[PDB]
Amino acid sequence: GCCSDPRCAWRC
Numbered sequence: 001g002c003c004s005d006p007r008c009a010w011r012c
Contacts, residue, residue: 002008 001012003010003012
């Protein structure tokens with residue numbers, strides 16, 4: 001996922 005990687009970090 002996106003947040004799976006801290007690039008996103010939207011609490012997943």
